[PDB]
Amino acid sequence: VQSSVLGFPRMGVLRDLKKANEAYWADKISQEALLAEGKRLRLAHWKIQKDAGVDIIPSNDFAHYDHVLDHIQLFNAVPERYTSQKLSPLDEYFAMGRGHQKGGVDVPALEMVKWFDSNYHYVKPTLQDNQTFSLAKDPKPVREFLEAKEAGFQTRPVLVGPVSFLALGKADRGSSVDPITLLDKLVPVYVELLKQLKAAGAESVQIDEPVLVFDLRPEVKAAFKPAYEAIAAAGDAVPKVVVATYFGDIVHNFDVLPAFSGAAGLHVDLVRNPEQLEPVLKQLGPNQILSAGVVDGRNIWKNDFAKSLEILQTAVKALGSERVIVATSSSLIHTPHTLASEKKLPSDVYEWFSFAVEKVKEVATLAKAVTEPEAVKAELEANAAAIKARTDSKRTNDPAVKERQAQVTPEQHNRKAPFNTRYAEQKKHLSLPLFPTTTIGSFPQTSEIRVQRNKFTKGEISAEEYERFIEKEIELAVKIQDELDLDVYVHGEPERNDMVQYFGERLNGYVFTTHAWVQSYGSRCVRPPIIVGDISRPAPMTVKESKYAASISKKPMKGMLTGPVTCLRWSFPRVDVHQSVQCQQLALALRDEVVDLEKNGIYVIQVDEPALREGLPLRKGQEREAYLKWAVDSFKLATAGVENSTQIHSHFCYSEFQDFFHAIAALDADVLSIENSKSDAKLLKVFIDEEYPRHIGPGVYDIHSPRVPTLEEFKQRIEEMLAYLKPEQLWINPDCGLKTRKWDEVKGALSHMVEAAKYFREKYANKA
Ligand SMILES: [Zn+2]
């Protein structure tokens, strides 16, 4: 039985790729140096995989910035504004990713959005009405395939398929084309590429059609037939094709599968959806290979070999060993490079982890174990012992947490009274005028804020010295808010680096790494916390700063928390228990924090859930509904312990809520802030259609621009929102936190914002 890896993380052991890209963008190294570093990394990673024993090794998975972006260039789908700049291929590539300035003209980047339900971001194919396609000179997949071959590595090239390419695309400015209608123009180019790959020596190709996990509109469904007939019709002139899917099941799209009857194999994610195995087996053509995705490409836990082998033997029994491939569930770009780089983890947790280097070995070990378990019996025994150790650990058997969870009731999820009763108490308590003004949370993160934070964590300044600095920063924020005449204050979060790490460090059940970076957005990476055990709160987490802030504040002061869904989803979660169990533990820990804030002079508490929408299962049905039920219940459990006179606020970083506005409404938040300033006011129609009965602050100030909007601009924006929202429900606030802005920009913009609010207060004042 063969082993397979769908993709390897690109950044390198020490984020070598990030260092090189950025050094190139800062003119410290030449194009030749950067490309050579790219080559060095690809070679090092191919070697890791071959040394591990991997039979089917990927190529074309590497990217300097983004693989979808690679495909845009590969198919000459580049808009005029980039090609007219007459740049080198590399500089044109980066121009689409980051932006570029040739001459007096400043060329912005293409839109980047999240890749399915991951934290990875891809560049959307951005297409013209008159779009045609052709294969780029020196096509990347062929180039990298031959490079691998020359260095002794036979590889399997990875393409994003034609249907997904367009499905994930959009019409450019000045165009209205529905991208999928360009299929007939694109398919020939894939056929030409596959012919070149085959002539270069590629025996098979991995073609990702990840949109198969979506609910597909009929136009997209109908695209698979012509696209894959064209590929099959090329016969032996193209490589064998394995169609790949991940991050969800495909059992709702069995009507699409006949399009792949001329393909050699199908890859399914059996980590996310193990239950899809046997229904999928029944849908395979008589000679088709199952690529069984059994090693998790999305998390950092050692594989359960015995569990994986049971799954694999089911496949082997049904199909025969020659029709089964042991594979990673998805690409490993979503995992860190290697566990060996971690020198400060607790000794007991090491044996539970596998990062990318460890995972590529795992597929080889499993593949060997399918037919010859004796050859790896010592490794199989070690694996079983690791899983047993995790099961038996004190970390995963906290009796107090278990007991607390067992006693949770439905009623504890609900506020003491509905909004219509609550609001009267809130109104007088907070003493809010019409059009109350506030901000979202963070204030400018200055050089000295970062410097002082670093010195404290390194131990170069004492706890007492740091706390005094934090006091002074909070005093400053409050002094500025006093001068601005804002109605509800924040403390600025000068003590906080990252909205999930800050909480992870102050909860039981978490561990932190030093080197476990994952590519997120071009060359920006994240280093997620890891949940290893049952979660609880040993001490107040944010009370000290909020308590001090309230002690000097003439206005209501916002408590500031990250919700249980985000504390969960923006970490690597456990796999030994269901995510709902983990989220509930977090919800109870945060419930305690909320109550502690309220006991310390805080009566406006903002709980933000930016991972909420991201966690949505990728298709509609019982799994999506199950997620929303526990995600919503977790937020409610965390926030429902407050008095009626306390306000619960929540900020959302989007302007559209397709599908899940019902979930937002089920949160029962008193006040909602949303991003809106750069969007058309017509998006606020959802609040009318859903008859939203509670309070709303659609952002009126674009915080991602250093420009100070004028008084008249703020007034015009407020007027536009009032076309959709009732005066009594309207809050006046920025689009988001202010960490990325400077204080001069903040003072100017917020001064104008408050003045605009005051103007409307007079316009809407009672007549004589
Ligand atoms: Zn936001």
PDB file of N, CA and C in Angstrom, residues 409-448:
ATOM      1  N   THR A 409     -27.496  23.840  33.493  1.00  0.00           N
ATOM      2  CA  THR A 409     -28.911  23.737  33.129  1.00  0.00           C
ATOM      3  C   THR A 409     -29.252  24.606  31.904  1.00  0.00           C
ATOM      4  N   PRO A 410     -30.356  24.281  31.200  1.00  0.00           N
ATOM      5  CA  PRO A 410     -30.815  25.157  30.124  1.00  0.00           C
ATOM      6  C   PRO A 410     -31.053  26.599  30.579  1.00  0.00           C
ATOM      7  N   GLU A 411     -31.626  26.774  31.768  1.00  0.00           N
ATOM      8  CA  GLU A 411     -31.986  28.097  32.288  1.00  0.00           C
ATOM      9  C   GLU A 411     -30.778  29.021  32.509  1.00  0.00           C
ATOM     10  N   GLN A 412     -29.620  28.440  32.827  1.00  0.00           N
ATOM     11  CA  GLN A 412     -28.401  29.223  33.071  1.00  0.00           C
ATOM     12  C   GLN A 412     -27.863  29.899  31.801  1.00  0.00           C
ATOM     13  N   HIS A 413     -28.430  29.530  30.654  1.00  0.00           N
ATOM     14  CA  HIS A 413     -28.069  30.124  29.362  1.00  0.00           C
ATOM     15  C   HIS A 413     -28.842  31.408  29.058  1.00  0.00           C
ATOM     16  N   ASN A 414     -29.861  31.707  29.861  1.00  0.00           N
ATOM     17  CA  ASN A 414     -30.756  32.833  29.568  1.00  0.00           C
ATOM     18  C   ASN A 414     -30.573  34.013  30.507  1.00  0.00           C
ATOM     19  N   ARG A 415     -30.688  35.226  29.959  1.00  0.00           N
ATOM     20  CA  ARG A 415     -30.664  36.445  30.767  1.00  0.00           C
ATOM     21  C   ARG A 415     -31.863  36.418  31.701  1.00  0.00           C
ATOM     22  N   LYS A 416     -31.774  37.158  32.804  1.00  0.00           N
ATOM     23  CA  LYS A 416     -32.846  37.212  33.803  1.00  0.00           C
ATOM     24  C   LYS A 416     -34.174  37.715  33.224  1.00  0.00           C
ATOM     25  N   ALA A 417     -34.097  38.587  32.221  1.00  0.00           N
ATOM     26  CA  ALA A 417     -35.283  39.180  31.607  1.00  0.00           C
ATOM     27  C   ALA A 417     -35.015  39.515  30.133  1.00  0.00           C
ATOM     28  N   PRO A 418     -36.067  39.519  29.281  1.00  0.00           N
ATOM     29  CA  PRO A 418     -35.869  39.890  27.872  1.00  0.00           C
ATOM     30  C   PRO A 418     -35.476  41.357  27.722  1.00  0.00           C
ATOM     31  N   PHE A 419     -34.966  41.719  26.544  1.00  0.00           N
ATOM     32  CA  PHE A 419     -34.448  43.065  26.278  1.00  0.00           C
ATOM     33  C   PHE A 419     -35.414  44.204  26.631  1.00  0.00           C
ATOM     34  N   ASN A 420     -36.691  44.041  26.298  1.00  0.00           N
ATOM     35  CA  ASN A 420     -37.693  45.074  26.580  1.00  0.00           C
ATOM     36  C   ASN A 420     -37.817  45.400  28.069  1.00  0.00           C
ATOM     37  N   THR A 421     -37.592  44.406  28.923  1.00  0.00           N
ATOM     38  CA  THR A 421     -37.553  44.628  30.368  1.00  0.00           C
ATOM     39  C   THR A 421     -36.193  45.167  30.825  1.00  0.00           C
ATOM     40  N   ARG A 422     -35.112  44.544  30.339  1.00  0.00           N
ATOM     41  CA  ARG A 422     -33.732  44.912  30.694  1.00  0.00           C
ATOM     42  C   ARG A 422     -33.404  46.351  30.374  1.00  0.00           C
ATOM     43  N   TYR A 423     -33.774  46.774  29.166  1.00  0.00           N
ATOM     44  CA  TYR A 423     -33.249  48.014  28.611  1.00  0.00           C
ATOM     45  C   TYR A 423     -33.562  49.253  29.454  1.00  0.00           C
ATOM     46  N   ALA A 424     -34.736  49.269  30.081  1.00  0.00           N
ATOM     47  CA  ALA A 424     -35.129  50.361  30.971  1.00  0.00           C
ATOM     48  C   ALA A 424     -34.093  50.550  32.089  1.00  0.00           C
ATOM     49  N   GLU A 425     -33.687  49.451  32.719  1.00  0.00           N
ATOM     50  CA  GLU A 425     -32.638  49.494  33.741  1.00  0.00           C
ATOM     51  C   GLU A 425     -31.302  49.973  33.154  1.00  0.00           C
ATOM     52  N   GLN A 426     -30.960  49.491  31.959  1.00  0.00           N
ATOM     53  CA  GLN A 426     -29.691  49.848  31.308  1.00  0.00           C
ATOM     54  C   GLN A 426     -29.623  51.320  30.938  1.00  0.00           C
ATOM     55  N   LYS A 427     -30.743  51.833  30.431  1.00  0.00           N
ATOM     56  CA  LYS A 427     -30.862  53.211  29.965  1.00  0.00           C
ATOM     57  C   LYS A 427     -30.437  54.226  31.034  1.00  0.00           C
ATOM     58  N   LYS A 428     -31.001  54.102  32.233  1.00  0.00           N
ATOM     59  CA  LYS A 428     -30.678  55.021  33.328  1.00  0.00           C
ATOM     60  C   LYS A 428     -29.290  54.778  33.925  1.00  0.00           C
ATOM     61  N   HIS A 429     -28.944  53.505  34.114  1.00  0.00           N
ATOM     62  CA  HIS A 429     -27.646  53.102  34.655  1.00  0.00           C
ATOM     63  C   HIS A 429     -26.495  53.711  33.853  1.00  0.00           C
ATOM     64  N   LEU A 430     -26.523  53.529  32.537  1.00  0.00           N
ATOM     65  CA  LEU A 430     -25.474  54.035  31.654  1.00  0.00           C
ATOM     66  C   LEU A 430     -25.654  55.512  31.290  1.00  0.00           C
ATOM     67  N   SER A 431     -26.846  56.047  31.564  1.00  0.00           N
ATOM     68  CA  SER A 431     -27.212  57.437  31.262  1.00  0.00           C
ATOM     69  C   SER A 431     -26.815  57.872  29.856  1.00  0.00           C
ATOM     70  N   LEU A 432     -27.249  57.094  28.870  1.00  0.00           N
ATOM     71  CA  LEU A 432     -26.849  57.329  27.491  1.00  0.00           C
ATOM     72  C   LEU A 432     -27.760  58.326  26.801  1.00  0.00           C
ATOM     73  N   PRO A 433     -27.168  59.260  26.043  1.00  0.00           N
ATOM     74  CA  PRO A 433     -27.973  60.127  25.195  1.00  0.00           C
ATOM     75  C   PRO A 433     -28.408  59.352  23.956  1.00  0.00           C
ATOM     76  N   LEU A 434     -29.228  59.973  23.116  1.00  0.00           N
ATOM     77  CA  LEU A 434     -29.499  59.432  21.795  1.00  0.00           C
ATOM     78  C   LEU A 434     -28.186  59.425  21.005  1.00  0.00           C
ATOM     79  N   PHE A 435     -28.043  58.479  20.079  1.00  0.00           N
ATOM     80  CA  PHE A 435     -26.794  58.300  19.313  1.00  0.00           C
ATOM     81  C   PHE A 435     -25.553  58.247  20.214  1.00  0.00           C
ATOM     82  N   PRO A 436     -25.517  57.278  21.143  1.00  0.00           N
ATOM     83  CA  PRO A 436     -24.361  57.193  22.030  1.00  0.00           C
ATOM     84  C   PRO A 436     -23.097  56.848  21.241  1.00  0.00           C
ATOM     85  N   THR A 437     -21.957  57.382  21.679  1.00  0.00           N
ATOM     86  CA  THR A 437     -20.681  57.163  20.999  1.00  0.00           C
ATOM     87  C   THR A 437     -19.759  56.261  21.806  1.00  0.00           C
ATOM     88  N   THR A 438     -19.041  55.392  21.100  1.00  0.00           N
ATOM     89  CA  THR A 438     -18.091  54.507  21.748  1.00  0.00           C
ATOM     90  C   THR A 438     -17.033  54.063  20.749  1.00  0.00           C
ATOM     91  N   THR A 439     -16.082  53.273  21.225  1.00  0.00           N
ATOM     92  CA  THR A 439     -15.121  52.644  20.334  1.00  0.00           C
ATOM     93  C   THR A 439     -15.122  51.145  20.592  1.00  0.00           C
ATOM     94  N   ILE A 440     -14.433  50.407  19.733  1.00  0.00           N
ATOM     95  CA  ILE A 440     -14.588  48.957  19.679  1.00  0.00           C
ATOM     96  C   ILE A 440     -13.702  48.224  20.678  1.00  0.00           C
ATOM     97  N   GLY A 441     -12.517  48.761  20.950  1.00  0.00           N
ATOM     98  CA  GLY A 441     -11.648  48.157  21.947  1.00  0.00           C
ATOM     99  C   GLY A 441     -10.233  48.691  22.001  1.00  0.00           C
ATOM    100  N   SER A 442      -9.398  48.234  21.074  1.00  0.00           N
ATOM    101  CA  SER A 442      -7.979  48.552  21.105  1.00  0.00           C
ATOM    102  C   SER A 442      -7.693  50.010  20.761  1.00  0.00           C
ATOM    103  N   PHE A 443      -6.683  50.566  21.419  1.00  0.00           N
ATOM    104  CA  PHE A 443      -6.137  51.865  21.059  1.00  0.00           C
ATOM    105  C   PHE A 443      -4.746  51.695  20.403  1.00  0.00           C
ATOM    106  N   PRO A 444      -4.228  52.743  19.724  1.00  0.00           N
ATOM    107  CA  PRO A 444      -2.940  52.660  19.037  1.00  0.00           C
ATOM    108  C   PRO A 444      -1.850  51.877  19.772  1.00  0.00           C
ATOM    109  N   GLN A 445      -1.302  50.860  19.106  1.00  0.00           N
ATOM    110  CA  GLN A 445      -0.173  50.122  19.663  1.00  0.00           C
ATOM    111  C   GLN A 445       1.117  50.804  19.237  1.00  0.00           C
ATOM    112  N   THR A 446       1.645  51.645  20.121  1.00  0.00           N
ATOM    113  CA  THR A 446       2.839  52.425  19.834  1.00  0.00           C
ATOM    114  C   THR A 446       4.092  51.581  20.027  1.00  0.00           C
ATOM    115  N   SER A 447       5.221  52.100  19.544  1.00  0.00           N
ATOM    116  CA  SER A 447       6.521  51.462  19.731  1.00  0.00           C
ATOM    117  C   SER A 447       6.814  51.147  21.209  1.00  0.00           C
ATOM    118  N   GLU A 448       6.608  52.122  22.095  1.00  0.00           N
ATOM    119  CA  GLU A 448       6.908  51.934  23.526  1.00  0.00           C
ATOM    120  C   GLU A 448       5.991  50.919  24.218  1.00  0.00           C
TER     121      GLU A 448
END
